Amino acid sequence: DKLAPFEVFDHVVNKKLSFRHVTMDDVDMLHSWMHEEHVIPYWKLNIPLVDYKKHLQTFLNDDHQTLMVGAINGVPMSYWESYWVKEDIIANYYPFEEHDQGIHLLIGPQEYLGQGLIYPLLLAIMQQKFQEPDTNTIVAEPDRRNKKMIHVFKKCGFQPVKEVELPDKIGLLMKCEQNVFEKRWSDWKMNKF
Ligand SMILES: [Cl-]
Numbered sequence: 270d271k272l273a274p275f276e277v278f279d280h281v282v283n284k285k286l287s288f289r290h291v292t293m294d295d296v297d298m299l300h301s302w303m304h305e306e307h308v309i310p311y312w313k314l315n316i317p318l319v320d321y322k323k324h325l326q327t328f329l330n331d332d333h334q335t336l337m338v339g340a341i342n343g344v345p346m347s348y349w350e351s352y353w354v355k356e357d358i359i360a361n362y363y364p365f366e367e368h369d370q371g372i373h374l375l376i377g378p379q380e381y382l383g384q385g386l387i388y389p390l391l392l393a394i395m396q397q398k399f400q401e402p403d404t405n406t407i408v409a410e411p412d413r414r415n416k417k418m419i420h421v422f423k424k425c426g427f428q429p430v431k432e433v434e435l436p437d438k439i440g441l442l443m444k445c446e447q448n449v450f451e452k453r454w455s456d457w458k459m460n461k462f
């Protein structure tokens with residue numbers, strides 16, 4: 270049931286985008302990303318390496334989600350959790366459909382921030398998640414304070430629904446319907462985003 274690895278060219282940014290499954294060999298790198306100042310407030314995983322290892326192992330053995338590393342021209346610089354809403358905490362907050370999916374993400378290295386690279390990456394992984402035939406909706410619940418990500422999500426087709434009082438944050442529940450997404454993905458690829 271896991272999201273498959275993939276590699277695509279993006280002609281807009283003129284880069285190779287590649288996504289692979291996370292493994293335990295990634296623990297030091299991922300641990301470093303979790304200690305970045307732009308990540309800490311939203312992920313809260315600035316914890317000792319020993320603990321991060323135990324957490325990563327548990328998530329890698331979790332069947333409702335797929336952990337991936339996203340890379341630009343082979344350089345790993347983003348972390349992704351792709352999941353089924355039905356088996357996730359967010360299912361409790363809205364009348365989800367059976368095959369709805371969700372996405373969590375971060376850009377790790379500072380050297381990959383501020384360059385608009387989240388768009389081609391997010392559009393690519395969304396496209397591959399939407400190839401599940403019965404999935405019509407993908408949801409996201411960014412912290413309500415993460416104005417930049419709320420903006421990025423809106424630009425990719427996500428519509429805000431309502432705040433969600435989650436254990437770790439007040440999120441903004443947002444839904445992206447496939448027909449809207451394909452139009453935005455096509456706008457992107459046709460240089461009219
Ligand atoms: Cl391609």
Ligand SMILES: [Cl-]
Nearest residue numbers: 278279280281
């Ligand atoms: Cl392309």
Ligand SMILES: [Cl-]
Nearest residue numbers: 311411412415
């Ligand atoms: Cl967030």
